[PDB]
Scaffold this active site. Structure first.
Site: not given
Ligand code: NA
Ligand code: NA
Length: 193
Positions: A26, A104-105, A159, A172
């Site tokens: 993101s 991530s995303q 995370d 993260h």
């Protein structure tokens, strides 16, 4: 910035040994982000830059923060773009080895696109790396329909997005070393010598 579009620009008359398709996290810029760019560099260092096509997931995928809350962890349009690119690799270069990944995303996007891909396309994807996988908990460390031996999930200590939440903390942002070392070593093992 660090974007790569080699699947989009490459010739089906010169298919490479490997094609990497990678979705960024993101708010990251370009189509690779902080982890996709060194991952692609590592594969080009191992096999030669002209023997790997590195491709990011861009277009409709805008890596919007709010799309983490949608049911599969990204937008339907972003997942469909992942599928579109996997299908382009299969149409242009059916006998090239595909490797995939996301952060991530982008790891949610990759997982959903591989789940939605045809049996043919999933079979062509010899290895996948997911960093900071936001559906780790919910998908029990895997990708639905994808054999575990082809997958590595990098979920750092602390995370919390890997633990069934969408809480983003400093661990993260800790995947740069793995993107330069363990993750490409794994993909190289699946591509082969
Ligand atoms: Na290349
Ligand atoms: Na790390």
């Amino acid at each position: 910035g660090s974007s790569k579009n080699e699947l989009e620009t490459g010739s089906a008359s010169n298919c490479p040994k490997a094609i990497l398709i990678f979705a960024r996290g993101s708010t990251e810029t370009g189509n690779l982000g902080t982890l996709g760019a060194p991952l692609g560099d590592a594969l080009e260092s191992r096999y030669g830059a002209s023997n790997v096509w590195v491709q990011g997931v861009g277009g409709p995928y805008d890596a919007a923060l709010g799309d983490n809350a949608l049911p599969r962890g990204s937008s339907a349009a972003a997942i469909r773009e992942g599928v579109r690119l996997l299908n382009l690799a299969n149409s242009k270069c059916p006998n090239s080895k595909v490797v995939a990944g996301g952060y991530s995303q982008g790891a949610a996007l990759a997982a959903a696109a591989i789940s939605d891909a045809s049996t043919t396309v999933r079979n062509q994807i010899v290895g996948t790396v997911l960093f900071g996988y936001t559906k780790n908990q919910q998908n029990r460390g895997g990708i639905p329909g994808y054999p575990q031996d082809r997958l590595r999930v990098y979920c750092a200590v602390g995370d919390l997005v890997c633990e069934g939440t969408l809480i983003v903390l400093a661990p993260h942002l800790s995947y740069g070393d793995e993107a330069r070392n363990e993750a490409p070593a794994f993909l190289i093992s699946k591509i082969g010598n």
